[PDB]
A paper describes a structure:
Out of 579,038 initial particles for the [name]–Ku complex, 170,770 resulted in a map for the [name]-C–Ku complex where, although the estimated average resolution was similar to the full complex, structural features were better defined. Here, the cryoEM map for the [name]-C–Ku complex shows clear volumes corresponding to the Ku heterodimer, and the presence of two copies of the C-terminal domains from the vaccinia [name] protein to form a dimer without ambiguity. The [name] dimer binds as a single unit at one end of the central channel of the Ku heterodimer interacting exclusively with the [name] subunit. The two [name] subunits are stacked on top of each other so that the lower [name] interacts with the side and top rim of the core β-barrel domain of [name] that forms the base of the Ku DNA-binding channel, while the upper [name] is held over the top of the β-barrel and directed towards the large hole defined by the bridge structure that sits over the channel and forms part of the Ku heterodimer interface. The lower [name] has a substantially hydrophobic interface with [name], with side chains of Tyr197, Leu198, Phe246, Leu252, Phe253, Thr312, Pro314 from [name] forming a curved hydrophobic groove into which the side chains of Val 2, Ile245, His246 and Pro248 of [name] protrude. This is supported by polar interactions of Arg368 and Asp369 of [name] with Ser247, Glu248 and Glu251 of [name], Lys399 and Arg400 of [name] with Asp194 and Asp195 of [name], and an interaction of the phenol OH of Tyr397 of [name] with the aromatic ring of Tyr197 of [name]. The upper [name] subunit makes surprisingly few direct interactions with the Ku heterodimer apart from a polar interaction between Asp258 and Arg400 of [name], which also contacts the lower [name] molecule, and glancing van der Waals contacts made by Ile231 and Ser232 of [name] with Lys307 and Glu308 from [name] at the top corner of the bridge. However, supported by its dimer interaction with the lower [name], it projects an intensely negatively charged plug formed by a helix-turn-helix motif from residues 233-255 into the mouth of the bridge. The tip of this plug is formed by residues from D245 to E251 containing several acidic residues that insert into the Ku ring, which itself displays a positively charged surface.
The Ku heterodimer, a component of the NHEJ pathway of DNA repair in the nucleus, functions as DNA sensor that detects dsDNA of viruses that replicate in the cytoplasm. [name] expresses two proteins, C4 and [name], that inactivate DNA sensing and enhance virulence. Here we determine the structure of the [name] – Ku complex using cryoEM. Ku binds dsDNA by a preformed ring but [name] sterically blocks this access route, abrogating binding to a dsDNA end and its insertion into DNA-PK, thereby averting signalling into the downstream innate immunity system.
Residue numbers in the entry:
A (entry chain D): 162 to 331
B (entry chain A): 33 to 534
C (entry chain B): -1 to 176, 181 to 189, 193 to 544
D (entry chain C): 159 to 331
């Protein structure tokens, strides 16, 4: 019943679904629409049920995974990643005006929990395969996400998001 | 009036095919390329004129009355794709070969018959006349020097055409030994009374010069408005306002009927939701919502709250030019010229004001109201002296620059910044870079890429051809040549300025 | 182009004197109470009709009552807080118009400043404010105590509260003093009393302590406040920066931020066409009917809107075009130097566009600042400008413009203005007037014009220090349309059954040159009228 | 399993039709569209019906459903937006609207076949069915919607965001 399967190691395989049904982690492959303030085109994050985001790819591969950049929300990832200027938080704040989350929509976020972080080479291979698969599907299947900056008039950032939900073994 | 007519008369004698220098364009090719450029400009500007190209001095003929050595390649019609394609077919070395093959060069002609054929072409048009103009593209200064009978008839016919209303113009090209207008012409070409007696264009040797001369002398100047400049309530003179610069926009699509492709001429109507009938202009009001309050005014009062002064220019004073800042630009400038048709004596006062303002280096601060019920803007009339280049082309018209001045509301605030200076060595290195990257700037050195691409696509579609070939943008910097010219100066500047860590 | 700002608000306390002496009359000048009312009304109308988020409080001192939270008995008396920190509305405007009356008492303005400080300190706890401002409208004709002055200055510095002072008179030095008196125009040290001098000294010293030498620039008169934007100077916000990299070649890049320096201010709201009786938009149905170009009256469906383009004498339909066929693929946002050229080659008459940009180095970038300073100084020393390609984003049409250096004592930057393309130039020919025998002016006419130009000079070389002074700087004058519109809107909101009032006299005064130029013109103007005959055509 | 994805709306005494969320065999799509605050937009709600050929029919607006009587059929959603939501005189003959991702408001990437015909109410129970559909869409518009983006070729070009609630169905023949 799994929508897709990715080989993790010799023993176990990881199931990838297009819907959030009893799933812990969500990988989002994001293409940012052209804005005069944004210097980065595409990114990729892993989000857990608490909203914690780990950055995976920045159109140069999965090499930025080793830096282990963890943010409390997707807005923080945007603040620290996609803007060339220094103090982005001093100019505006990013939020969704419908209280929607990039991965869980209008669900209840869980309390602060530790984010899954790759350790072994099997994890790195799995993320490489997942990023290639997400890039393959990005041209056909994706949805629209909107963030709003509290400027006068308000700034709108449009994202094209491809989402994949899955779980890691204990 | 409103539909100008222009006839391109191109000589086809042997001298129009000698090139002398092997790197210089043939005068015939110069003429063909100039005409094709004029066609492209007319289509791009969407200007509805009538153009015709006629050759004389050929063995074959196509004119209505079967005169000798006069081919009418194109009659008077709006510019289009196929005419430009044919002219392009005549272009170049192969174009010259095919031109000679299909219309041979070198024969005896008579200018009287050529002008008669051009007059008949002007007469054959049904959609009014307005301005009628003929341009000669020749490099022979004495065409009938051995036949005085032809020359006298040519002068008589030229005088008759000038009396009818047709304006004859010369585009003399480079000739070995120079071109002398006083030999044969000056008895045929049109001279505008005493204003255009002297100051005639020099002979053309390059394509850009000839194109500039052709475009300068066929475009009729249209005034945006004809305002009044008032020194006070009593002394008022008449001036014309012109837009020497204007942004070129991509034409929007037009609506056409499926049964027959033609304009629709859309109309707007006001309807009532309940009754379903028409609404009189006095049966509606204007509203504005502020918070939870509705403010209601009639249309007349909405117009009245914008009314300050009557239209025209009111003189406020005279201010030194050093007090005008280059970084206070607000909106594109206009041009102010005297108008003699409305108030008699305006030109003398205009000339005296221009002369004295140039002598004293002063600008006239005035208040500007373009039309009725418009709040005023402060403008500066900066005196502008006439300037001509080596070809005697007017690169700068005499008159006044109308420069718009910002209000306090149009000046925005800058954030606080700490001033960081640069050491003299870094400034010297950057000076070296600037010197290595020097060129000469001209106001007509760049073309709009979006417009060019749009019209190239439209031209390919109208000719029912395949996808066109994209052209390299001329506003995109040539990074490779810049890098080769700069060399290691960039590396040295980076070593002096950029810290190794960042 | 449009202005995009950060989204921060400000708290403004207007401290106004309503005491006895700020009501005196004189044959030719309005009382200081009325002029202060005009300035406050201007400020509040702009705030209300621009729908800003700034919060305004009003504190009157000199009143007959006492409504301040620091009264405590026999202390801070005759100080009323007429309006607490909230968004301005039409109730405040009505109060300023015809509900606040002159008092019959006197109050120390330092105590009023203390009360205003207390309002800011205690009414901003639960909210966020980027700037805290106090504007004081007084005449300095009351006794005051100097005891609390140091505490006042320390509190202002600690809490970061700015001050502006507005007085019936000016702060000019050696002005030289000078028909009917006009308010708000561009053109009295002996007319002030000793108490006014002492108050002025205290105000000047407080301003110097708060800011410095530039603090004296922030003491205005009621007359010049109506013809300036001074009341909005400390609550203005700059635009969000445009970040990019100035590239000279493919190996030299400088991180830059561009701000809008000049941008035309426009009315934010349009007029909604509504029904005469119901006063609602829903009763109006506006439709477009093209039908046919002939008198046939045949029903036309919207399915026939296919449209097409014109290439002269031919039509290319939309059935033969594609969305991806005709689209200039921009290389992206860029600020790239096409090259360098002499300053005299780029002229002002060819400037195009509707904005001017100021280009600084990126914030917190020492290397970028040094590199940009080197470029600016190299351009200034060699008298050169940069021709650059400018693209706002991947969708905006690319532009070609000029960047020229701008060096001042406190900052240095580049200035960008758009330049024309070939298609934007109209090559007309005009008859020469110098070489015209028909329109050649005589010597007497030239002398008369010279006299007129000499008599209508709007500049002066004062002090013989080779310094040229402007007697009519129009770039410091606000646009009269906004004030006229606000006045008419307020009159309609408060007096529904009355016609719109005429234009205020001070708007006319600020749109006209000083009266010293008029008669100096009138004599040579009369001379010129005789020498130049101007007869209107009688076609 | 307290949520529902397929609903039933009764048309007449014998035939009651189904309203789905996915386009897995449907032909008609009703879109309930809301526009956020903007400096060039004054119309908030516009409802449309779209076929696989891309032909669109105006159904409802802020004034109710009685505008379906006018039978306003256009060839694209951008055309409807320019006609209705951009009724400003300056904005009428000003610019155009397009989607940069080649994605339709009803069928996304799915190809549009050649135009065949347009469904339009002819009966009297059809108006009742359309009213019921509009009411159901409006009831679910506060929590069930997706984002749609259009680009207007202004100077500089602007981006318009729409909240769309989509319902797919087949009208029996």
């Amino acid at each position: 019943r799994s929508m897709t399967t990715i080989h993790y190691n010799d023993d176990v395989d990881i199931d990838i679904h297009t819907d959030k049904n009893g799933k812990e982690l969500c990988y989002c492959y994001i293409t940012i629409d052209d804005h005069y303030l944004v210097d980065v085109e595409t990114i990729g994050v892993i989000v857990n049920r608490s909203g914690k985001c780990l950055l995976v790819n920045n159109h140069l591969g999965i090499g930025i995974v080793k830096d282990k950049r963890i943010s409390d929300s997707f807005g923080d990832v945007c603040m620290d990643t996609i803007f060339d200027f220094s103090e982005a938080r001093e100019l505006f704040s990013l939020t969704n005006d419908d209280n929607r989350n990039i991965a869980w929509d209008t669900d209840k976020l869980d309390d602060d929990t530790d984010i899954w972080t790759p350790v072994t080479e099997d994890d790195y291979k799995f993320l490489s395969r997942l990023v290639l698969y997400a890039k393959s599907q990005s041209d056909t299947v994706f949805d629209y996400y909107v963030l709003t900056g509290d400027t006068e008039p308000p700034t709108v950032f449009i994202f094209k998001v491809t989402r994949f939900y899955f779980n890691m073994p204990k | 009036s409103g539909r100008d007519s222009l006839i391109f008369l191109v000589d086809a004698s042997k001298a129009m095919f000698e090139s002398q220098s092997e790197d210089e364009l043939t005068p015939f090719d110069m003429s063909i390329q100039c005409i094709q450029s004029v066609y492209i400009s007319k289509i791009i500007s969407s200007d509805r004129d009538l153009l015709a190209v006629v050759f004389y001095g050929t063995e074959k003929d196509k004119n209505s009355v079967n005169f000798k050595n006069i081919y009418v390649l194109q009659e008077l019609d709006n510019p289009g794709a196929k005419r430009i394609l044919e002219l392009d077919q005549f272009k170049g070395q192969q174009g010259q070969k095919r031109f000679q093959d299909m219309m041979g060069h070198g024969s005896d002609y008579s200018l009287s018959e050529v002008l008669w054929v051009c007059a008949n072409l002007f007469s054959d048009v049904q959609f009014k006349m307005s301005h009628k103009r003929i341009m000669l593209f020749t490099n022979e200064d004495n065409p009938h020097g051995n036949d005085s009978a032809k020359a006298s008839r040519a002068r008589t016919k030229a005088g008759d055409l000038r009396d009818t209303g047709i304006f004859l113009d010369l585009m003399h090209l480079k000739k070995p030994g120079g071109f002398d207008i006083s030999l044969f012409y000056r008895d045929i070409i049109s001279i505008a009374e005493d204003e255009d007696l002297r100051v005639h264009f020099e002979e053309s040797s390059k394509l850009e010069d000839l194109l500039r001369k052709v475009r300068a002398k066929e475009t009729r100047k249209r005034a945006l408005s004809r305002l009044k400049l008032k020194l006070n309530k009593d002394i008022v003179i008449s001036v014309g306002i012109y837009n020497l610069v204007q942004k070129a926009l991509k034409p929007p699509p037009i609506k056409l009927y499926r049964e027959t492709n033609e304009p629709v001429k859309t109309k707007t109507r006001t309807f009532n939701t309940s009754t379903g009938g028409l609404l009189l202009p006095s049966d509606t009001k204007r509203s504005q919502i502020y918070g939870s309050r509705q403010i209601i005014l009639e249309k007349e009062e909405t117009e009245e709250l914008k009314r300050f002064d009557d239209p025209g220019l009111m003189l406020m004073g005279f201010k030194p030019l050093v007090l005008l800042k280059k970084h206070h630009y607000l909106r594109p400038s206009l041009f102010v010229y005297p108008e003699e048709s409305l108030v008699i004596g305006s030109s003398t006062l205009f000339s005296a004001l221009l002369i004295k303002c140039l002598e004293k280096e002063v600008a006239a601060l005035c208040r500007y109201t373009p039309r009725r019920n418009i709040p005023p803007y402060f403008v500066a009339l900066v005196p502008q002296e006439e300037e001509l280049d080596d070809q005697k082309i007017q690169v700068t018209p005499p008159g006044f620059q109308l420069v718009f001045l910002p209000f306090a509301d149009d000046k925005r605030k800058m954030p606080f910044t700490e001033k960081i200076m640069a050491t003299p060595e870094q400034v010297g290195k950057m000076k070296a870079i600037v010197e290595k990257l020097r060129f000469t700037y001209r106001s007509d050195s760049f073309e709009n890429p979006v417009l060019q691409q749009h019209f190239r696509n439209l031209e390919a579609l109208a000719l029912d051809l395949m996808e066109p070939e994209q052209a390299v943008d001329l506003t995109l910097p040539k990074v490779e040549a810049m890098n080769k010219r700069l060399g290691s100066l960039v590396d040295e500047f980076k070593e002096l300025v950029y810290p190794p860590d960042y | 182009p449009h202005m995009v700002r950060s989204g921060n608000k400000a708290a403004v306390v207007l401290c106004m004197d309503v005491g006895f002496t700020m009501s005196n009359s004189i044959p030719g000048i309005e009382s200081p109470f009325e002029q202060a009312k005009k300035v406050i009304t201007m400020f509040v109308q702009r705030q209300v009709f621009a729908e800003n988020k700034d919060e305004i409080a009003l504190v009157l001192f000199g009143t007959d009552g006492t409504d301040n939270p620091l009264s405590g008995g026999d202390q801070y008396q005759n100080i009323t807080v007429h309006r607490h920190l909230m968004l301005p509305d039409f109730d405040l405007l009505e109060d300023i118009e015809s509900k606040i009356q002159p008092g019959s008492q006197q109050a120390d303005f330092l105590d009023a400043l203390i009360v205003s400080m207390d309002v800011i300190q205690h009414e901003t706890i639960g909210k966020k404010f980027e700037k805290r401002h106090i504007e004081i409208f007084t005449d300095l004709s009351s006794r005051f105590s100097k005891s609390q002055l140091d505490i006042i200055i320390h509190s202002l510095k600690k809490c970061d509260i700015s001050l502006q002072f507005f007085l019936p008179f000016s702060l000019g030095k050696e002005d030289g003093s000078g028909g009917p008196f006009r308010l708000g125009g561009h053109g009295p040290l002996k007319g002030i009393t000793e108490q006014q001098k002492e108050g002025l000294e205290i105000v000047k010293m407080v301003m110097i302590s708060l800011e410095g030498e530039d603090g004296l620039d922030e003491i205005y008169s009621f007359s010049e406040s109506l013809r300036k934007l001074c009341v909005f100077k400390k609550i203005e916000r700059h635009s969000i920066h445009w970040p990019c990299r100035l590239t000279i070649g493919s190996n030299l890049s400088i991180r830059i931020a561009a701000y809008k320096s000049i941008l035309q201010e426009r009315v934010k709201k349009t007029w909604t066409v509504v029904d005469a009786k119901t006063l609602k938009k829903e009763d109006i149905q506006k439709e477009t009917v093209y039908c046919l170009n002939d008198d046939d009256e045949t029903e036309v469906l919207k399915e026939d809107i296919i449209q097409g383009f014109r290439y002269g004498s031919d039509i290319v339909p939309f059935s033969k075009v594609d969305e991806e066929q005709m689209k200039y693929k921009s290389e992206g946002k860029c600020f790239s130097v096409l090259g360098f050229c002499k300053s005299s080659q780029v002229q002002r008459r060819f400037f195009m566009g509707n904005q001017v940009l100021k280009v600084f180095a990126a914030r917190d970038d020492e290397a970028a600042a040094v590199a940009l300073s080197s470029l600016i100084h190299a351009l200034d020393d060699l008298d050169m400008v940069a021709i650059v390609r400018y693209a706002y984003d991947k969708r905006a049409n690319p532009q070609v413009g000029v960047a020229f250096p701008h060096i001042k004592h406190n900052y240095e930057c580049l200035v960008y203005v758009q330049l024309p393309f070939m298609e934007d130039l109209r090559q007309y020919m005009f008859s020469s007037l110098k070489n015209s025998k028909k329109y050649a002016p005589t010597e007497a006419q030239l002398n008369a014009v010279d006299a007129l130009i000499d008599s209508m000079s709007l500049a002066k070389k004062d002090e013989k220090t080779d310094t040229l002074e402007d007697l009519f700087p129009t770039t410091k004058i606000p646009n009269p349309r906004f004030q006229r519109l606000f006045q008419c809107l307020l009159h309609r909101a408060l007096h529904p059954r009355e016609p719109l009032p005429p234009i205020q006299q001070h708007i006319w005064n600020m749109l006209n040159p000083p009266a010293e130029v008029t008669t100096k013109s009138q004599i040579p103007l009369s001379k010129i009228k005789t020498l130049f005959p101007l007869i209107e055509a009688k076609k």
